[PDB]
Amino acid sequence: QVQLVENGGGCVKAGGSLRLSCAASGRLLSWYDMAWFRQAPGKEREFVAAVTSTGAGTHYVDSVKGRFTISRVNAENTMYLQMNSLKPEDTAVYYCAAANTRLTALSLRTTTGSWAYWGKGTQVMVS
Amino acid sequence: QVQLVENGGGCVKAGGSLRLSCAASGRLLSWYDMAWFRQAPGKEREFVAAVTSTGAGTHYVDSVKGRFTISRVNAENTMYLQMNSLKPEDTAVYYCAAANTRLTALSLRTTTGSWAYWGKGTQVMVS
Amino acid sequence: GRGAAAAILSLGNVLNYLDRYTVAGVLLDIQQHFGVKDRGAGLLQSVFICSFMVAAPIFGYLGDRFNRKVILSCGIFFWSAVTFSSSFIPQQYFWLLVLSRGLVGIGEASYSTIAPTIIGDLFTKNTRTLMLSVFYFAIPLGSGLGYITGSSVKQAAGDWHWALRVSPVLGMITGTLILILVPATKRKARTSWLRDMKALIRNRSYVFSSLATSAVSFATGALGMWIPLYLHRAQVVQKTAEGAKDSLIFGAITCFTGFLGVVTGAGATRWCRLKTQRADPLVCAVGMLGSAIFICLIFVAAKSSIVGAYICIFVGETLLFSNWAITADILMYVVIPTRRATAVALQSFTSHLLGDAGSPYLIGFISDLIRQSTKDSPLWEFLSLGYALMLCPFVVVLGGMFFLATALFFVSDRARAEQQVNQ
Amino acid sequence: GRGAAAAILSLGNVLNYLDRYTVAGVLLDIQQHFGVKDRGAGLLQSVFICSFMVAAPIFGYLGDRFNRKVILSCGIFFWSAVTFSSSFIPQQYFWLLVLSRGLVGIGEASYSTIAPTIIGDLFTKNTRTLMLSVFYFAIPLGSGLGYITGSSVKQAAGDWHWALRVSPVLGMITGTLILILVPATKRKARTSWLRDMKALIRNRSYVFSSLATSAVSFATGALGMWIPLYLHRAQVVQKTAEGAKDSLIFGAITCFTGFLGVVTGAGATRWCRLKTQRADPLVCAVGMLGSAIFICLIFVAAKSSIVGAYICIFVGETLLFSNWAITADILMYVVIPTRRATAVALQSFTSHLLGDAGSPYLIGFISDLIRQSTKDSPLWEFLSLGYALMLCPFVVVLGGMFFLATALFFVSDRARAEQQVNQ
């Protein structure tokens, strides 16, 4: 019982910074683990990043490691993904995913099927 | 034996003009009917516009009618789609399709299956 | 047995053209037996072609009305019996032979108009288009075999009547084979046809292509009808003497040249299409122009020797026959789908009328006039026939110019047709 | 018949707790028959709990080694025979009764440690989770039926030995039913366990929850062991007299309060979870605090009347039993998956040691000391037992404070647990 709303996605020049914000209000956000999954126009959604329900542990896929930073504020029930040094391959529709809290390694939870909640997503483009 | 290359697609503000150019060098452009088809990241490809192998007849879908203009320069082996009064619904990846010359009405040829040629789509995002 | 049925259809087409050109094979024997001038010799084929004309659309309508196989088999039997009777017509009655030729033309038009509908109804796919391909190749082979069989039978049996007696037995056998193997397949208006016509006349490239195809038909008819006699007369003028062998060689060369011309025209148009959109008409013109030159050279060569004349026959026949496969493509690209059938019918009618229908009789009339104005001898007969044939390459050049105009207006009229289709 | 097997497992658990609390049901009769002070009455249950402790981990290891059903059935037969012998122990020998209670504790620990493994091995679905839930609900019903059956049999047969004689027959029947219906299911290290332990001690909320669960176990043991005697003594002090009816009512209220407390605790934690992440521990504390107040009020009420004391039993039992279903969730959320089994085992050991193991004997010792220091009479016995029981609500309040500290550190140690899992 949670609704995910993605905002902050737009066109940005190559090498620019952009923040994608996922907001949830259906239920307290501290009870759910969150993630960002980007879908390409001709490819299925892929793992971008994930954060635990508490925000202590964060996981990023190899391609995105070192450029995007995922940070969640439970006070605002929000999750912000800051993206820097954007590249043309990063162009995609970023969707926000939330899942019931489980003590399962995030690196193991990259099948984009364990997340029982999803949102419309905010599109992003590079140069 | 015709290769289709799309170019000129980029981000433009809401209500801004843009041009998408489709080039073909494998064979002469005056031998194949051409068309632009829009695909959403999470939806199937849809008919945007079509033009005959000669350029005398042009067809546009009802939604895009009055805002987009399709014109083919057979001498340069190119087809330009000028998009104006862009709206957020237009946000999609535009692919260029070419098909063998047949005397079949373009309005009837909206199944995106009669076109035997396709090119990498150039995405166009407007906000 | 649809494949076997189409095989028998192709055999029947071969025999149809064999019977059509058998008379041309034994032209000299008929003329000498009836004591008729060249005018009647040309009139035979002229009447045949006129009957073919007046029969083709009516037989198409009949096929649209009733079953196709029944009409086709009845036609086979009809013209087989007519030819068999032609082989027994008394010498004193030549009008009877002309009337029999007309009836044979009616029957052969029935066959030529009904067979493709049957082929399309049987398969109605790519396999059916393949059945139509070999069915058409039966045409040049049919003509060559007609000239060869007529000459061979006339020389072997010592009577030209046997050349006509042989064919009807094969006609009856093929008719029975057709009737058994072919399975029955099932698959105001005048004002609408008049509207379609008016639309066609509004088109420039279609009219030019029709006129050029008429010129091609004129040339083909006149030559195929008078060349064996011309070769015999040239041999007579020269000291060397054998005119059955010349007709045999002409038939063999005609068959091989039909095949070679079709294939080379297809290849050349395929290549030229990659250069310009208007390549399809252009090619035609080019070929015909070349052919025209050669179609003239032969005549001069015919006075010097027969081997050079035969080489000229080879080259000119190839160049002239290259045009048929491309004329259909020109018509298809020029006319819209709705008016394509009416366009094809009108083009066939015009091509037979302005050309083939009046070419043989015209050649005969010119030859007879030249003979009458001058001293009578075999050499002057040869010269008169040579001039009458030389008339043809000018018509071939005119048809080439018509194809050139078609090339000029092709792109603009392909644009109008597509615009009309879209609207 | 896996479902039938789990049904018999639930029945066996009901009978296990029935046999466990039968002695508490006939506490007064045993004390009067053996002439033993309150110290020995508490020592019975203390020895039982110590044996249960020292048996649970060893029996878990044995189940990991050998088959589970065989051990469980052997245990059923073992403690059934031990209780049957307990019903025949001579009056002069009380140490024999204590030893028999210890052996019964060993057997019941074997059952309590083996049954859930069997249930998990049988199925791994929602139906298996439902089987685990029914087995869990057998506990409060088992205890209530133990107190009711002991009291009823002691009053009906006029001998408390019959209360112990009845159970072993059901034990043997249930053991045979288990052995037949249950299908056999198949599904250094010390250093690793020590590492896991050290990690647990590094955790604050886990230790606080363990201490609070120990306080809960202390309260439950002491009360369930000494409250029926307290009610009888209160009735004796008052002019009104019936102490079997009081034990029967206590057992019924205990069963109903166990059910109600489980359900209400689940609902309350479900609601409070939506407000704050620390809701799961907090709730516990709250409940216990309330319970503590009531757990004290009863004693005062017990001197005024028995009906008010029974209402206090109802409310306090509900509040105290609300904690069990939430303690497991707290432990699961605090500890990582790898160290969850070791954490559960250590928490059970600590809860039985710091609490239940030494609560009954401590209550008996305090009551005996108060009696000895003062004049001897039934009223002073009642007052001594009342003070010894009043000791418990202070421990309940201490456990509530421990749950409050667990609530305070829950978010930080949950953040520490997830970070370790990710790394």
Any chain D CB within 8 A of the CB of A106? yes
3-state secondary structure chain D: CHHHHHHHHHHHHHHHHHHHHHHHHCHHHHHHHHCCCHHHHHHHHHHHHHHHHHHHHHHHHHHHHCCHHHHHHHHHHHHHHHHHHHCCCCCCCCHHHHHHHHHHHHHHHHHHHHHHHHHHHHCCCHHHHHHHHHHHHHHHHHHHHHHHHHHHHHHHHCCCHHHHHHHHHHHHHHHHHHHHHCCCCCCCHHHHHHHHHHHHHHCHHHHHHHHHHHHHHHHHHHHHHHHHHHHHHHHHHCCCCCCHHHHHHHHHHHHHHHHHHHHHHHHHHHHHHCCCCCHHHHHHHHHHHHHHHHHHHHHHHHHHCHHHHHHHHHHHHHHHHCCHHHHHHHHHHHCCCCCHHHHHHHHHHHHHHHCHHHHHHHHHHHHHHHHHHCCCCHHHHHHHHHHHHHHHHHHHHHHHHHHHHHHHHHHHHHHHHHHHHHC
Question: CB distance from D337 to chain A under 8 Å?
Answer: yes
Burial grade of A5 (CB within 10 A; 0-12, 13-18, 19 or more): middle
The b-or-e profile of D232-269 (16+ CB within 10 A means b, else e) is bbbbbbeeeeebbebbbbbbebbbbbbbbbbebbeebb
Residue ranges of A 49-108 with Cβ closer than 8 A to chain B: 91-93
Interface probe, candidates D418, D419, D420, D421, chain A, greatest A C-beta count within 10 A: D418
Domains of chain C, CATH where assigned: 1-187 (1.20.1250.20), 188-423 (1.20.1250.20)
CA-based nearest residue to C319, from C286, C291, C296: C291
DSSP letter (8 states) at residue B55? S
Q: State how far residue B101 is from chain C, nearest Cα, in angstroms.
A: 9
Q: Is B11 on the interface with C (CB under 8 A)?
A: no
Strands (E), chain A: 4-7, 11-12, 18-24, 32-39, 46-51, 58-60, 68-73, 78-83, 92-100, 117-118, 122-126
Which residue of chain A comes nearest to D410, CA vs CA? A54
CA distance D248 to C381: 145
Distance of residue B31 Cα from the nearest chain C Cα, in angstroms: 7
Chain A residues near residue D416 by CB distance under 8 angstroms? 56
Q: Which residue range(s) make up the domain with B13?
A: 4-124
Q: Judge: A41–B125 Cβ closer than 8 Å, yes or no.
A: no
Tally the residues of chain C: 423
Question: Which residues in B lie closer than 8 A to residue C417 (C-beta atoms)?
Answer: 103
CATH number, position A26:
2.60.40.10
At position D233, the amino acid (one-letter code) is R
Q: Is residue A86 part of a domain?
A: yes
Report the candidate in A53, A40, A42, A61 with the shortest Cα–Cα distance to residue A117.
A53
- Closest among C2, C6, C114 to C67, alpha carbons compared: C114
Nearest to D336, CA basis, from D416, D249, D242, D229:
D416
Q: Count the alpha carbons within 13 Å of D166 in the hemisphere toward its beta carbon.
A: 20
User: What's the token pair of residue C283?
Assistant: 């090619």
Do the chains A and B touch each other, judged by at least 3 C-beta pairs below 8 angstroms?
yes
Contact of D166 with D152, CB cutoff 8 Å: no
Structure token digits, residue D286:
């709250």
Beta strands at A122-126 and A11-12: parallel, antiparallel or unpaired: parallel
Nearest one of D421, D36, D387, D9 to D177, comparing CA atoms? D9
Smallest Cα distance from A31 to chain D, Å: 7
The answer to whether the CB of D138 falls within 8 A of the CB of D113 is no
Asked if residue A90 is part of any domain, the answer here is: yes
Say whether A91 sits in a helix, a strand or coil: coil
Q: CA C382, CA C375: separation in Å to the nearest integer?
A: 12
- For C230, C253, C312, the CA distances from C307, given in Å and listed in that order, are 13, 12, 9
- Which experiment gave this structure? cryo-EM
C274, C416, C423 ranked by CB distance to B28: nearest = C274
Query: How many other β-carbons are positioned within 10 Å of the β-carbon of residue D349?
Result: 17
Residues 6+ apart with CB under 8 A from C180: none
Which whole-number Å values give the CA distances from B27 to B37, B100, C296, D418, in the listed order? 21, 11, 39, 60
C336: CB partners within 8 A, 6+ apart: B103, C417, C420, C421
CB atoms within 10 A of CB A43: 10
Burial C13-39 (b: 16+ CB within 10 A, else e): bbbbbbbbbbbbbbbbbbbeebebbbb
Closest CA–CA distance from residue A56 to any residue of chain B (Å): 32
Strands B122-124 and B92-100: antiparallel
Give every CB contact of residue D388 below 8 A, 6+ residues apart in sequence: D222, D226, D362, D363, D364, D366, D367, D370
Burial environment of residue D168 by CB neighbours within 10 A (0 to 12, 13 to 18, 19 or more): buried
- Chain C residues with CB-CB distance to B106 below 8 A: 422
User: For residue D365, how many other CB atoms are within 10 A of its CB?
Assistant: 17
Number of folded domains in chain A?
A: 1
* Residues 63-102, chain B, touching C (beta carbon < 8 A): 74
| D341/A contact by beta carbon, under 8 A | no
User: Looking at this protein, which amino acid is placed at residue C399?
Assistant: G
Residues A14 and D99: their CA atoms lie apart, in Å, by: 81
Q: B94 to chain A: nearest residue by CA?
A: A41
**Cβ A93–B123 below 8 Å, yes or no?**
no
Q: Look at chain B and count its residues.
A: 127
Touching chains, C (3+ CB pairs < 8 A): B
Whether A110 maps to a domain, the answer reads: no
Q: Do the domain assignments include residue A108?
A: no
- A30 has a chain D CB within 8 A of its CB: yes
Q: What three-state secondary structure class fits C409?
A: helix
Helix (H) or strand (E) holding B18: strand B18-24
CA D60 to chain centre: 19
Compute and round to an integer the Cα radius of gyration of chain A: 13
Contacts with B11 from chain A: Cβ below 8 Å: 11, 125
| Cβ within 8 Å, pair D273-A58 | no
CB D24 within 8 Å of CB D148: no
Q: Cα separation of C363 and C228, whole Å?
A: 14
Answer whether B41 sits within 8 Å of A123, measured CB to CB.
yes
Q: Which of A57, A74, A104 faces D419 most closely, judged by CB atoms?
A: A57
D2 token code pair: 């896996």
In a domain, A10, yes or no: yes
Other Cβ atoms less than 10 A from the Cβ of A71: the count is 12
CB contact under 8 A, C336 and B103: yes
